[PDB]
Each structure stands twice: as structure tokens, then as C-alpha cells.
């Protein structure tokens, strides 16, 4: 997730909401990377086992992919520093953030 400072925090809570602009944000109002935008006329949101986010529009015969949700892993999970709001940030004891597809 992207903090207002532009830095990246990491959260495990999955209750996501949509802001007035149509983007996916964490329930604390923080915008979760990658930028996954849900359009105005969305009928149903399908998030697959591998993090592929799709929406189905009215009158459109095929579902439309609006992004790809990835998972970040750390070689040392304990070293992450909590900043509240169910958010962890990376320290030097928490290794480095490794982005990966959910199932890889």
C-alpha cells in the first residue's frame, strides 16, 4: 500500500474499499499498490486465486481486467515495524520486499 508520503507500507488485512475516484484503497483510506481502478459502471468484482482482478460491465460480452494484485514477501517477517492501522514498514532486519504473484 502507498502511504501519503509516497513510501510503501505492507498490510495483511484485506477489507478493501473504493474511494470517490474509483480506485482500490485499504479500509483506512490508504491506496493499495498496484493502482487497481474499478470503473463507475461495475456490476461484479472477481478477484481470482492468483490476484487477477476483473470486472464485468453491462452489455459487454467479456469480463474486463482492471489490474493485478501482487503479494510482497520478506525473508524476515518479524523485523517489520508496525506503524498502526494494521500496517508494517520495512526495516533493515526485515530483509527487502520481494514482489511475487499470489501462487508463485
Amino acid at each position: 500500500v502507498m502511504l501519503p508520503d509516497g513510501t510503501s507500507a505492507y498490510t495483511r488485512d484485506g477489507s478493501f474499499q473504493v474511494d470517490q475516484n474509483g480506485q482500490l484503497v485499504t479500509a483506512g483510506g490508504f491506496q493499495v499498490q498496484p493502482a487497481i481502478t474499478i470503473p463507475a459502471n461495475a456490476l461484479s468484482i472477481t478477484i481470482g486465486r492468483d490476484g487477477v482482478v476483473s470486472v464485468t460491465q453491462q452489455g459487454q460480452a467479456a469480463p474486463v481486467q482492471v489490474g493485478q494484485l501482487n503479494l510482497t514477501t520478506f525473508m524476515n517477517d518479524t523485523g517489520l515495524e508496525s506503524i498502526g492501522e494494521n500496517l508494517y514498514i520495512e526495516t533493515q532486519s526485515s530483509g527487502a520486499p520481494n514482489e511475487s504473484t499470489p501462487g508463485l
Binding site: Q17, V18, Q20, N41, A42, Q58
Partner: protein, 50 residues
């Protein structure tokens, strides 16, 4: 009416929001628009996303 003729008097408009949750409930089973919910998109029933 009684002259075997009918007269349309209006069409009920429906509102759809970008964030249905951000709505601030005012009670009386009634919601109010909020910056979190965004502006209301107006339309007719049974068309588009309505």
C-alpha cells in the same frame, strides 16, 4: 383517466454511487451523500448499471 387516455406524470430517477459504503446514514432508513461516497450518478431504472 376516464377518457380512456393516459398521461405520464414523471419518471422515478435512481442514483448510483462510486463507493456505496462511504454513504453517511442519517436515520429514518435514509442515506446522505458524502465526500467518501462521491457525487451521485443519476439514471433511469432498468438501464445501464441501474
Amino acid at each position: 383517466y376516464s377518457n380512456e387516455q393516459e398521461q405520464v406524470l414523471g419518471q422515478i430517477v435512481l442514483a448510483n454511487f462510486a463507493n456505496n459504503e462511504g454513504l453517511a446514514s442519517q436515520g429514518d432508513n435514509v442515506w446522505a451523500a458524502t465526500q467518501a461516497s462521491g457525487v451521485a450518478l443519476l439514471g433511469t431504472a432498468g438501464s445501464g448499471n441501474f
